[PDB]
């Protein structure tokens, strides 16, 4: 008696979930901004629920 | 109150070298970067030169480049323009304009908010 290979199922469907939310993220509030900061003091803004 | 004077404005034959000011008085001359204005007679106005708070900077319009130099004072409150090989497309009424101290959005905008009384320069012969 030998040993030979293996067996394993194989899988058949996709199942993707992700919270459904439409709020668009605000990315331009800080990219086209008309003035920045000076890097001795930067500006951190947070982000979330976007 | 605020008020500029300048003087230094007179008829010359081509091919001459002249000095004009103006001497500020009513704020902080170091303060502020100063600009030179001309006005031809009938026209409208053109820019000319700039120089900095501190006189380490300047900078000057491609049509006097080379001709046309530019000086501060800081302790005796003058700024002086220096004209080179004069030529008879330079007569106006020259104007020392002070920049504008708050521009809002961006920081390329420039406006002069107070100007001089000016000094008419003429060439002929
Ligand atoms: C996802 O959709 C379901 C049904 O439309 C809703 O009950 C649920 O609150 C949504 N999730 C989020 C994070 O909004
Ligand atoms: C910023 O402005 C540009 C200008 O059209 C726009 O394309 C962009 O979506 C805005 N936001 C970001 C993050 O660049």
């Known amino acids: 008696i030998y040993q030979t290979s293996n067996f394993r199922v194989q899988p058949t469907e996709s199942i993707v979930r992700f919270p459904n939310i439409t709020n668009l993220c605000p990315f331009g509030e800080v990219f086209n901004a008309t003035r920045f900061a000076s890097v001795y003091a930067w500006n951190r803004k947070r982000i979330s629920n976007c | 109150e605020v008020q500029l004077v300048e003087s230094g404005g007179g008829v010359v034959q081509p091919g001459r070298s002249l000095r004009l000011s103006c001497a500020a008085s009513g704020f902080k001359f170091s303060k502020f970067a100063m600009h030179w204005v001309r006005q031809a007679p009938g026209k409208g106005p053109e820019w000319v030169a700039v120089?900095?708070?501190?006189?380490?900077?300047?900078h000057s319009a491609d049509s006097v480049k080379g001709r046309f130099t530019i000086s501060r004072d800081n302790s005796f409150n003058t700024l002086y323009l220096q004209m080179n090989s004069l030529g008879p497309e330079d007569t106006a009424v020259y104007y020392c304009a002070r920049d504008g101290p708050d521009t809002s959005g961006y920081y390329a905008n420039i406006y002069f908010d107070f100007w001089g009384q000016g000094t008419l320069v003429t060439v002929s012969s």
């Open positions: 120089i900095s708070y501190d006189g380490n900077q300047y």
